[PDB]
């Protein structure tokens with residue numbers, strides 16, 4: 180009797196294992212299959228889906244012991260989708276050296292250590308009591324455990340499969356259970372009638388890949404999808420022209436960017452990276468494609484960071500003439516530089532690129548698009564410029580300047596950014612320092628090096644736009660996920 184929900188999506192994640200699926204496409208699926216110890220109550224106090232309040236979820240109760248540990252008292256009688264009782268053994272395994280942050284774990288869960296704080300091994304005190312802690316002071320543990328790092332996995336089942344096989348047949352405690360997946364096509368979930376919280380309101384949820392937004396909007400209009408993702412503010416005119424459809428959007432805690440393969444000779448030094456950055460007139464892109472709804476950050480700095488947000492920081496300058504000078508100095512010889520984009524996987528990716536191509540022409544640089552189809556992974560050696568995004572997944576400046584751009588992490592190790600020694604020393608400091616002036620001072624210097632080095636160019640915080648049938652009552656949240664608990668009803 181419950182209605183079946185059909186969501187037209189931009190893509191599917193590479194895995195449904197909670198960490199390996201961290202992407203713009205994963206959380207919207209992963210958040211239904213799993214629960215964390217702590218959950219973000221996005222709509223608390225009438226908030227329009229952007230409240231940061233963290234509430235009990237698989238942890239019935241929790242108390243901070245000191246500056247580096249929290250005791251969690253677990254909800255009793257919670258079952259995983261395979262009938263198994265969720266216990267402290269499962270929570271300890273989820274945040275253990277074996278599964279997440281140990282040397283052997285990061286070979287199969289590659290960002291398990293990169294994204295984690297300085298964990299120490301969890302302590303199981305009893306069946307429903309577990310202490311989670313860091314070796315060094317950290318007032319961010321609650322924030323990590325309520326983020327996309329937090330989903331609790333079943334110990335026996337996950338171990339008997341391994342992270343990647345688990346990622347294709349996930350088992351969690353969440354309100355929807357995995358039914359099936361067809362690679363690069365769809366994922367279907369079904370109501371978990373054993374759920375401990377709000378009873379699921381959809382019989383099934385199907386995430387159907389419709390890579391082209393043009394076809395996705397047409398599918399919504401023709402009655403094929405109840406909700407569609409990854410639209411732009413300019414899609415309002417077509418969608419809202421229909422009385423039974425509407426767009427629903429919000430500013431999300433994500434950053435659209437372009438970055439470089441710094442192993443490539445032309446981008447080994449900061450000179451052309453900075454030239455590409457200074458040639459971009461971001462207010463003009465935000466006015467032309469985002470209806471002035473996207474936000475331009477003032478450095479690698481967001482109000483979401485709270486105590487480590489710097490409101491007085493000046494934004495990076497649009498400086499066409501200086502970009503011209505930097506191009507000439509760099510030795511650039513007019514060779515075409517490619518910019519790889521998987522179509523409009525990122526909302527406004529292709530129109531923003533075309534506007535930046537004209538801005539780059541004005542600076543004396545030839546950039547050409549290299550639009551690749553879904554399921555056609557280009558090799559790193561073929562990449563010069565590429566687009567990317569970073570979810571700003573903690574209310575703290577550590578994510579993602581440190582979690583992505585820090586020492587030993589992907590931008591330096593895979594994409595070859597030669598960060599100054601000073602940057603890597605300060606990344607290590609902000610992880611071990613408690614909230615304060617020294618931590619803020621270190622983030623100020625890290626942001627100055629980041630702006631000077633330009634390993635990536637921050638475009639804007641997107642205004643994420645969805646569209647839906649007016650009979651589907653659901654509000655977007657300020658993050659790259661979809662929340663349906665207490666937020667999905669039909670009629």
Ligand SMILES: O=P(O)(O[C@@H]1[C@@H](O)[C@H](O)[C@@H](CO)O[C@H]1O)O[C@@H]1[C@@H](O)[C@H](O)[C@@H](CO)O[C@@H]1O
Pocket residue numbers: 191192193201202203204433567568569570571579583659
């Ligand atoms: O959707 P994305 O912008 O990037 C995804 C990537 O995560 C995924 O593995 C890949 C193949 O499926 O497709 C995209 O490049 O996700 C980023 C993620 O890469 C990053 O780790 C995270 C935190 O910075 O932010 C996401 O927004």
Ligand code: NA
Pocket residue numbers: 445510511512513514
């Ligand atoms: Na060249």
Ligand code: NA
Pocket residue numbers: 654655656657658660661662
């Ligand atoms: Na949402």
